[PDB]
Write an enzyme that holds these catalytic residues in place. Structure first.
Site, PDB file in Angstrom:
ATOM      1  N   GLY K  56      47.741  49.509  48.188  1.00 30.47           N
ATOM      2  CA  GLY K  56      48.185  49.235  49.680  1.00 30.47           C
ATOM      3  C   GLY K  56      47.242  48.858  50.388  1.00 30.47           C
ATOM      4  O   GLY K  56      46.613  47.817  50.238  1.00 30.47           O
ATOM      5  N   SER K  85      44.841  47.910  43.158  1.00 39.59           N
ATOM      6  CA  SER K  85      44.533  47.524  44.317  1.00 39.59           C
ATOM      7  C   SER K  85      43.400  48.517  44.922  1.00 39.59           C
ATOM      8  O   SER K  85      42.118  48.865  44.372  1.00 39.59           O
ATOM      9  CB  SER K  85      45.567  47.092  45.275  1.00 39.59           C
ATOM     10  OG  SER K  85      44.904  46.805  46.688  1.00 39.59           O
ATOM     11  N   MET K  86      43.890  49.282  46.047  1.00 39.85           N
ATOM     12  CA  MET K  86      43.186  50.417  46.699  1.00 39.85           C
ATOM     13  C   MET K  86      43.283  51.565  45.777  1.00 39.85           C
ATOM     14  O   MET K  86      42.255  52.333  45.756  1.00 39.85           O
ATOM     15  CB  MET K  86      43.776  50.722  47.963  1.00 39.85           C
ATOM     16  CG  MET K  86      43.547  49.649  48.759  1.00 39.85           C
ATOM     17  SD  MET K  86      41.727  48.945  48.869  1.00 39.85           S
ATOM     18  CE  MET K  86      40.680  50.077  49.480  1.00 39.85           C
ATOM     19  N   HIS K 110      43.457  43.494  42.377  1.00 36.69           N
ATOM     20  CA  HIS K 110      44.351  42.684  43.177  1.00 36.69           C
ATOM     21  C   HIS K 110      43.640  42.555  44.630  1.00 36.69           C
ATOM     22  O   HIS K 110      43.140  43.507  45.151  1.00 36.69           O
ATOM     23  CB  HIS K 110      45.721  43.520  43.265  1.00 36.69           C
ATOM     24  CG  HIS K 110      46.583  42.678  44.509  1.00 36.69           C
ATOM     25  ND1 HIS K 110      47.065  41.389  44.119  1.00 36.69           N
ATOM     26  CD2 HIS K 110      47.043  42.956  45.456  1.00 36.69           C
ATOM     27  CE1 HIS K 110      47.673  40.984  45.116  1.00 36.69           C
ATOM     28  NE2 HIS K 110      47.700  42.155  45.947  1.00 36.69           N
ATOM     29  N   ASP K 156      44.354  38.874  39.395  1.00 35.09           N
ATOM     30  CA  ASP K 156      45.255  40.345  39.077  1.00 35.09           C
ATOM     31  C   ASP K 156      44.775  40.461  37.815  1.00 35.09           C
ATOM     32  O   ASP K 156      45.526  41.071  37.083  1.00 35.09           O
ATOM     33  CB  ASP K 156      46.629  39.856  39.573  1.00 35.09           C
ATOM     34  CG  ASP K 156      46.927  39.681  40.727  1.00 35.09           C
ATOM     35  OD1 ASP K 156      46.630  40.108  41.644  1.00 35.09           O
ATOM     36  OD2 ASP K 156      48.058  38.628  41.080  1.00 35.09           O
TER      37      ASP K 156
END
Lengths: 175, 176, 177, 178, 174, 175, 176, 178, 177, 174, 178
Positions: K56, K85-86, K110, K156
């Protein structure tokens, strides 16, 4: 007006009517209205009723039926996709010789189960018996056979329907 | 405009009106409007009222009735599917000789229960119009007031034939 | 356009207007608009107002009334179903000789409760209320005392009783061609 | 009337109809209605059916098809964006010689599993079995492929480019320019 | 009919069509329908497509493109406000010599991210590659450069776009 | 839990139950549950049922009735505001001698009008007749009188109810 | 927590469970959970299941049944208001000798119509469990399989007495 | 539980109940429930009913009243903000000598017109007439005024200040300080 | 707190967990949480997982599975109503010897359709899919070819057929005190 | 129970009540209920009323006021954020010597605008006049000045309020 | 409280916290709250963070991280299902030596695009700063060059449990029952 209603309206101008949903008082009223309208506009030209309905209430279908018989012009019935319960009834109620079935149409027989409850029961009993009678008359089958087949939810292919007596034609090619 | 409204309008042009739902102030007003409109357009040509209604409020039905009588032209009534309570009343209220029933139509009698004003006043009014309804019903059918009340009380219902006999309609139209 | 609105418009073309609901600012604006329109279209031809209303706000009904009086043409009023409160008022406010009642119409008198600063609203209501009683008395030809008295006890009338009281000039069963 | 419906109606006047969504009873009824209408208006002039649909229920597609065969006029089919399941079927069901595919159209085969009306599951199963077999048969007839290959390819969700589709037998032409 | 649809219809009568929203199956079908209609009405007269879209699905834009090429008449494209992703593609896909950009229009390049998932992946790979190829063809740039610039979401002013090869003219006045 | 539910729960702890809404399957189940719960907790102590209901379905009320009779402890019934149809029935179904009426309570008799419709009619007929029977038994009136009064929607004041036999007491002062 | 849930929980503490609605996967899971919970708490004390249900899915009911049989303790069933289709099945599935019916309870027989998987597979499964349901129903009532199917077919219903005779329950409890 | 309901419950533990909204069947049932509960818990200790209600249906208020008379314990009534229609009735229905009014409370008389259950209008009218008469009677009994004056004042929606209310007979005291 | 949640919590206290709905990220998170909690509370006592699920996402079920294997305590699995797709997988993933099926339970095999960049998602799905087949084969003791083959044609099993195939170790009619 | 209600309840246990919203019949009933409860629990210990309200209906605020005076214990009032209309009234209605204002609180005066309309008007007139009277009594200002300042919606800072007579102290620290 | 919240609370008592959804300000605040709470209760005992999140907002995740570093106790991180991602960032941000991955966990890198929510220029500026900070910290966690972090983030890149262990996201792959 929407596209769908526009197409149905332009079809109405061609004296073509559709029964593509459940049979109830509202749809019945609309259908009856259309029949009366077309009958008013021209009583000499046929009306084509295309059916793709799961059926519904007996009273509604009988109202539609009465309005059909009331119309002086012939009413050709077409089993388009599915004619179940009253869909089947209205299909078979078409003018003799002008009852058509599409090759992959499906005709289902079904015994519907349907103020004071006793009164409702009385009325239902009467109209039910009458439906069986008229169904037997349309198909040319014995009432015993109509009731028996209705009980066990017998269904028909286009061919089986043609044989049974629901329709007079199967439109395999270029109507 | 919708398909439904379009056919009803095109029917209206053919001087054909429908009562296919429960009778209330809104439907009454609409029906009265249609009758007045057709009466305004042509006072010599008949009006055809097709009835498939479970009935409803007496006051609403009486308003319709007054508007029917007000119209100079004859109003032919057709029992299409079901004529209950005020549906039956309005059916029988048609011009005599032009009250029709379809073969599998059903006529139900019933005394309504009625129900920003004082309850006592509403009760008074309801009593009056109710008594009047019975009177007119007796007049339409040619039955005694006592029999109308008696049959209304026990929710007597009729087939097309039984209705013709009782006096609700004048004909049973199998074919036109 | 709907079926209902179409019929009302087609009726409007026949110079026939309807009051079939409670009287409020919206209905008032709409009715007044219709009256002004018909008056604009032709000021010599009558307007027929059919009433089946439980009544409503005094100010709204008074607005309709003012617009009626403003119209040069005669306004014929018909008690179609029920004329209560301002329905009765607007009924009686019709052109004298052209106030009709149908046989089973019912006319109900009723003193509204009304309901900016509350004091101002109260003042205005008192004024317009008094004026209503006055005009009602003028319409019916009854004493103001009788109007207030009968209004208090929610007196209601049949078509005959209404004709006698002075709300209407005719009881019409049937119309001629 | 909306702009979209207006364009579709004005197109209808040009005897052009669209199948741009999943196939169900409502879309079927509407499409069938349009075909019957166009057939009624003029039975000598072709009808152009442009297809960009992910497919759907067999019964619905078959109803459309039956209505297509019913129509006396020729029905030209165009694979516009995607013809999947019944989209592919209705595409291939077009009048032979007038089945077109756009250069970047995609034809997907797929055996629907069907499945929720007011009826017994046994009856529904029976009906589905019949119409399923009938689909495979007609699909084989349209493409000129063996029924076994139709079933085999349907099982593994085989998909085609315009060229591959032309080769397989779904369409007769690939229309780059007009 | 609403005012907006009325203006768009009246524009349709002038053979002018709009792409002012994200590109999806619905917008694609509608746009394709309009193109076919205009082509049916008159196949000799040009069609003017005004573009102010953030782009969208490749398959949809490709459907639009196929329908564009299918139309016999020339299709003039106008970068009115923003042509991103498939907006840029359809812009550059206009008839050569009739691709216009308004002075403050912005052209954005972008690699979209896009049944059984494997099949969907296969198809996307195919159409993506084809999209790059055609984009290169439209702009006259190498495929390597299209991909390269697409990766880093390169954007252009009207002039930069004219230079790159997206459009043929910058029309300050008609 | 809300305040209302809290008060009803604390009342339940005092073996006090309320029927203040229409009688249906859901309310019946809840009421039956409460009776069973209180019966389980202590079978020797009375249960007090306060009634202010417009009535409802016969089947539901009969389920409540059966559960009442099933409970070993006595069930005192109180006509609080209105006991109509089955409200009246459940009121009169209270333990003899422990059926109370509040001074301005109102007891209404009413004949309810109430799968396959024929089956529903059959069942309704049976249970209806049974209700009349039990009502006659509770009040000590003839079945003919129960039916007759039910037909014409006869209603009673607290006094008239005491006389008729619905209740045994009128709580005019300080219970 | 609500009043309704509170009484049901307090009842659960008294080892009393309710089936007062149509039978589906959710209610089945909840009921199974309650049975397992009570079985876990005490495997020697009876469980009382009060039934007032219009019935429902066979699969759901069978899951409940398996969980009932799984429980070591006896499960007494009470026909409280109505036991239709699977309500009737679960009623009769109670521990023999502890199947009760209240005086005005009604037992209805009915063969369900059933209805992310292939329709053919679902049909197969339904056929199996249906046949099994009939078998177990015959076993519970002590009636022939033929009679169970026959009566199920024509939606035969029973009064408390008729149910006792047929074999659904063992007692009719007027008073406890 | 909410803060409000918590305060009301904790107040209930102190045998203090509130009527702060219009009187209807639901509020009546809830209030009656509370009275019965408090009566059950302890029949010797008073109950304090604080009233700030615009009134409502007669049947509901009468049900509350009947439940009040049923309660063995004394019920002290407090006109907190406004006691209108049945608010006034229930206020005056308090145990004589324990009917209080707050200094700026307002007592409004008003004859409700009633009016929508599943029943005949005639029956509803009858019932309403009876209970209406009964209200007037009891109101007269509470205040010690003639029935004619109760009806007369109700007709013209007479309202009272705390002092005027004390004089009229609605309450026995005006509680400035405690 | 609801009745249902209360029963589930009270069951949780009895180290009994339920999977009575479709397998997704939310249900997975919740189930994993419950497993970790019970494992944290007591790592020596068994956990009983009752299954009546139509299955769902592979990734979700694999998350549950990893959490199961992570738990030191044995995990007994019960086919209560239906174990389809990942329901079947999690059923068979139970501690060997403690995988039970009730007499009328039904085990359905099924190859999920799965469904960021689509290419990446496809890659991941292929991997996790293959791994599922492997583990399913390992659980049942069937060849991978047989697992894939049967998965393709949506083969389903009765309790007996499942016991034979290798999904479960017992068919329990009744439990002892 | 929610966090907010939990804090308010825990505060209630500390004999601290809040008026942080518009004054209406509902808020009045709730506040009155709280006061009665605290008075019932302990009639010797003070009650602290913290006010941050834009005001509201006179009748409601009067109900609150009557309940305040009814409570035997002293009621300390705190102008926490804003005391407008009836917020100001209830603030000034606090026990003399125990009416506090926080340094940046603002006190607003305002004439509210407020069955048969005539009756409602009568009652409003009465309660309004009474409100002015009591306000004058609280502040120690002439009735003429209260009305005069009320008309023009005069507002005060903490100091100006202290001077005017709304509060007795400005508490920078407890 | 519901069952889900109850188990999470019961888990909280066992010093176990969950990140099973997308990272935003709300979830961040809640997680930060939980960490601060556990740190307050006992600063000597470890905290277990189980991650199954699609990632996010950077700012939100960074807040969680800052709160993680703020906590004196060690924070063990577990890649349960998905760390994207996070999710990946917070996973790798775990205490060195106590970063675990479940056998079939998947870690996705990402580069977030941030986006609008004041002046766009400022938001862009802030995003640039924190993005750079993320890459830096990610590089620090994994022990990879920043260039490779950016490069892999751009395309990615995703990892299996093994590949992740190799890359440096986690220190162990916990197959068995630690």
């Amino acid at each position: 007006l929407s596209l769908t209603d526009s197409v149905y309206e332009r079809l109405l101008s061609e004296r073509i009517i559709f029964l593509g949903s459940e049979v109830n008082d509202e749809i019945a009223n609309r259908l009856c209205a259309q029949i009366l309208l077309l009958a008013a506009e021209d009583a000499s030209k046929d009306i084509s009723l295309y059916i793709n309905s799961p059926g519904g209430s007996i009273s509604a279908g009988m109202a539609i039926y009465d309005t059909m018989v009331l119309a002086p012009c012939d009413i050709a019935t077409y089993a388009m996709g599915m004619a179940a319960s009253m869909g089947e009834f209205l299909l078979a109620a078409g003018t003799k010789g002008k009852r058509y079935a599409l090759p992959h149409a499906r005709i289902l027989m079904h015994q519907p189960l349907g103020a004071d409850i006793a009164i409702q029961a009385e009325q239902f009993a009467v109209i039910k018996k009458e439906m069986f009678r008229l169904n037997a008359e349309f198909t040319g089958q014995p009432i015993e056979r109509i009731e028996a087949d209705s009980d066990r939810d017998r269904w028909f292919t286009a061919a089986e329907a043609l044989e049974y007596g629901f329709v007079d034609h199967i439109i395999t090619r270029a109507h």
